[PDB]
Design an enzyme around this catalytic site. Structure first.
Site, mmCIF file in Angstrom:
data_model
loop_
_atom_site.group_PDB
_atom_site.id
_atom_site.type_symbol
_atom_site.label_atom_id
_atom_site.label_comp_id
_atom_site.label_asym_id
_atom_site.label_seq_id
_atom_site.Cartn_x
_atom_site.Cartn_y
_atom_site.Cartn_z
ATOM 1 C CG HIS A 201 107.208 -10.989 66.794
ATOM 2 N ND1 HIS A 201 105.842 -11.378 66.483
ATOM 3 C CD2 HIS A 201 108.003 -11.665 66.059
ATOM 4 C CE1 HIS A 201 105.966 -12.262 65.436
ATOM 5 N NE2 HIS A 201 107.251 -12.539 65.322
ATOM 6 N N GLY A 202 105.680 -7.966 65.826
ATOM 7 C CA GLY A 202 104.109 -7.542 65.202
ATOM 8 C C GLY A 202 103.584 -8.498 64.646
ATOM 9 C CB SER A 203 101.603 -11.270 64.745
ATOM 10 O OG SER A 203 101.620 -12.247 64.258
ATOM 11 N N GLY A 210 97.016 -18.092 69.269
ATOM 12 C CA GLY A 210 98.091 -19.054 68.903
ATOM 13 C C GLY A 210 99.493 -18.752 69.282
ATOM 14 N NE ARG A 217 103.471 -20.776 66.370
ATOM 15 C CZ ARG A 217 103.081 -19.852 66.777
ATOM 16 N NH1 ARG A 217 102.465 -19.884 67.982
ATOM 17 N NH2 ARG A 217 102.675 -18.879 66.074
ATOM 18 C CB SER A 243 107.471 -4.967 65.127
ATOM 19 O OG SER A 243 108.529 -5.288 65.307
ATOM 20 C CE1 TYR A 246 106.348 -7.830 58.122
ATOM 21 C CE2 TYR A 246 107.520 -6.846 59.750
ATOM 22 C CZ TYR A 246 107.477 -6.985 58.367
ATOM 23 O OH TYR A 246 108.522 -6.845 57.536
ATOM 24 C CD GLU A 327 114.561 -8.049 58.460
ATOM 25 O OE1 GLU A 327 114.465 -8.912 57.737
ATOM 26 O OE2 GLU A 327 114.734 -7.019 57.976
HETATM 27 C C1 LIG Z 1 109.464 -13.119 58.190
HETATM 28 C C2 LIG Z 1 108.464 -11.851 58.269
HETATM 29 C C3 LIG Z 1 109.231 -10.600 59.258
HETATM 30 N N1 LIG Z 1 110.091 -10.074 59.191
HETATM 31 C C4 LIG Z 1 110.289 -9.280 60.355
HETATM 32 C C5 LIG Z 1 111.281 -8.446 60.646
HETATM 33 C C6 LIG Z 1 111.320 -7.799 61.798
HETATM 34 C C7 LIG Z 1 110.248 -7.756 62.649
HETATM 35 C C8 LIG Z 1 109.064 -8.802 62.342
HETATM 36 C C9 LIG Z 1 107.923 -8.741 63.009
HETATM 37 N N2 LIG Z 1 107.037 -9.917 62.906
HETATM 38 O O1 LIG Z 1 107.819 -7.823 63.899
HETATM 39 C C10 LIG Z 1 109.268 -9.368 61.064
HETATM 40 N N3 LIG Z 1 108.320 -10.385 60.547
HETATM 41 C C11 LIG Z 1 108.500 -11.015 57.049
HETATM 42 C C12 LIG Z 1 106.871 -10.795 56.728
HETATM 43 C C13 LIG Z 1 106.306 -11.355 58.075
HETATM 44 N N4 LIG Z 1 107.038 -12.043 58.699
#
Ligand SMILES: C[C@@]1(c2nc3cccc(C(N)=O)c3[nH]2)CCCN1
Length: 350
Positions: A201-203, A210, A217, A243, A246, A327
């Site tokens: 999970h990348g962000s 947060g 969330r 990931s 992101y 996904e």
């Molecule tokens: C929903 C969305 C998202 N889809 C993903 C599918 C696999 C991994 C991740 C992740 N966050 O690592 C995803 N994040 C679309 C654009 C930003 N968030």
């Protein structure tokens, strides 16, 4: 001075960085003069999300240009941008609604970070680090470079990352083991669910205070849905490639953070194209979007029942999918147990 290891101390500095907060805002064309950091508010954001939804509705129905003009203006009145001349863009497509919402999610996580950062006693009794470390409510430990954990992880990152989308190469700087307050109890029940997998999970890094403080969330009801291929859920990937994109890094800021979470998938409802679920078929407890690329099944490894799909990376049975990668979406926060956080360095080939 702080008792926390060096690498941990540096992780705190990173996520609680204020200049990063400002940078993220200015990169969104946000006038920090009119919309300073301390002006951000949950309420202002729900409202913006709601405008965004209305736009989608307008966009889907084919509203009369003026309705889309006032909705557009209503949004920029809420979130003050600076263009000077030229004028603010019209939000007249699923495309603009997706970008703006993504920005609101991020801005919201920034409000949370600035708010935690400010809340609490600022008495110099203890140093900023240890204090801000407490605010996250999660236990962070360094994982030794030469441990089987680290080795498992580094292999998961190398195998699942290929020369194909090779715009960059990945260097694992630090890996942390993480246990948030109440993730041990909330998950224990959902753990009694088969098909538990260790996924990515990348962000953005500005979202990490947060994410650790409140966990991953699910988007609020007012959020538009455009952008969530399989509806409002929590998304993961089994290839660090999907990931990592992101983390939104660059040659300007090449280092990012990414999570590894154990998600109790249960029976997976498999799909090849977008579908707004949320309400799963009976006996299904998660969605799996089928990609063209899968990690090699034969190389999958295990752990306490947690499958680690660190297989190299091959073509899958079906290519007739709209997905390059897999996904995994779950619609209950309790099905997620964040275990590791990794500080990654991106070396772009440019
Ligand atoms: C929903 C969305 C998202 N889809 C993903 C599918 C696999 C991994 C991740 C992740 N966050 O690592 C995803 N994040 C679309 C654009 C930003 N968030």
């Amino acid at each position: 001075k702080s008792k926390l290891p060096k690498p941990v101390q540096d992780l705190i500095k990173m996520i609680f960085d204020v200049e990063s907060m400002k940078k993220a805002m200015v990169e969104y064309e946000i006038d920090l003069q009119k919309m300073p950091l301390g002006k951000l508010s949950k309420r202002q954001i729900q409202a913006a999300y709601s405008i965004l939804s209305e736009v989608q509705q307008a966009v889907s129905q084919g509203s009369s240009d003026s309705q889309i003009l006032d909705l557009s203006n209503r949004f920029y009145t809420l979130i003050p941008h600076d263009f000077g001349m030229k004028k603010p863009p019209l939000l007249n497509n699923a495309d603009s609604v997706q970008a703006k919402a993504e920005m609101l999610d991020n801005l919201l996580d920034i409000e949370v970070a600035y708010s935690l950062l400010r809340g609490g006693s600022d008495d110099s009794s203890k140093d900023p680090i240890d204090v801000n470390y407490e605010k996250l409510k999660t236990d962070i430990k360094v994982v030794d470079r030469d441990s089987e954990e680290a080795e498992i992880i580094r292999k998961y990152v190398k195998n699942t990352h290929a020369t194909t989308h090779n715009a960059y190469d990945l260097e694992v700087i630090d890996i942390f083991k993480i246990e948030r307050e109440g993730e041990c109890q909330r998950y224990k029940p959902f753990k009694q669910l088969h098909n538990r997998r260790l996924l990515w999970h990348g962000s953005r890094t500005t979202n990490f205070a947060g994410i650790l403080s409140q966990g991953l969330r699910i988007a609020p009801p007012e959020a538009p849905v455009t952008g969530y291929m399989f509806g409002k859920g929590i998304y993961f990937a089994d290839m660090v490639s999907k990931s990592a994109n992101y983390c939104h890094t660059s040659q300007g800021d090449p280092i990012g953070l990414i999570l590894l979470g154990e998600v109790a998938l249960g029976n997976m409802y498999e799909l090849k194209h977008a579908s707004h679920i949320s309400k799963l078929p009976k006996g299904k407890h998660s969605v799996k979007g089928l990609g063209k690329t899968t990690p090699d099944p034969s190389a999958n490894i295990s752990l306490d029942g947690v499958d680690v799909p660190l297989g190299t990376g091959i073509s899958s049975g079906v290519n007739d999918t709209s997905l390059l990668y897999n996904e995994y979406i779950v619609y209950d926060i309790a099905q997620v147990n964040l275990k590791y956080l990794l500080k990654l360095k991106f070396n772009f080939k440019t």
